[PDB]
């Protein structure tokens, strides 16, 4: 079924996804608050 | 100007030194204790001076197996009594 290396692959995949997702959620949030007035 | 307040205004400010006369010695002392209590050794797997060789052994514990390298290292550590 799922080998340990495949499990690990999923763990890496998800770790990276969480990192990018958090980064962009934070960046988008900040940019929403801190709007460039024109 | 970039918008933020000049650094020379900050590092000459009393508030700054009130904050940092606490935070800097704290961080320093913390790293100090990270070493002096031996935690660093156990976090990074770094041999103490008495831990490079078993008493009569004289061969480096070189990792030779890629996929059970973890196990091999654990074995080498067990062989230190």
């Amino acid at each position: 079924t799922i080998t340990p290396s495949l499990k690990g692959f999923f763990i890496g995949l998800l770790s990276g996804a969480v990192v990018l997702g958090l980064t962009f959620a934070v960046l988008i949030a900040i940019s929403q608050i801190d709007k460039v007035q024109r | 100007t970039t918008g933020e307040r000049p650094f020379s205004d900050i590092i000459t400010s009393v508030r700054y030194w009130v904050i940092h006369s606490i935070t800097i010695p704290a961080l320093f002392i913390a790293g100090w204790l990270f070493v002096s209590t031996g935690l660093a050794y156990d976090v990074f797997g770094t041999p103490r001076p008495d831990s490079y060789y078993a008493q009569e052994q004289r061969s480096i514990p070189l990792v030779t197996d890629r996929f059970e390298a973890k196990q091999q290292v654990e074995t080498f550590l067990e062989q230190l009594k």
Partner: protein, 32 residues
């Protein structure tokens, strides 16, 4: 609770640096 990009940039470097310097200081007194 207001941070800035400059504050963050400064501290992600400064905080570990002080910590590490304390560590290395301590290391100077280790004996074999």
């Amino acid at each position: 609770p207001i941070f800035t990009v400059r504050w963050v940039a400064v501290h992600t470097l400064a905080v570990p640096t002080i910590f590490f310097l304390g560590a290395i200081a301590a290391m100077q007194f280790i004996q074999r």
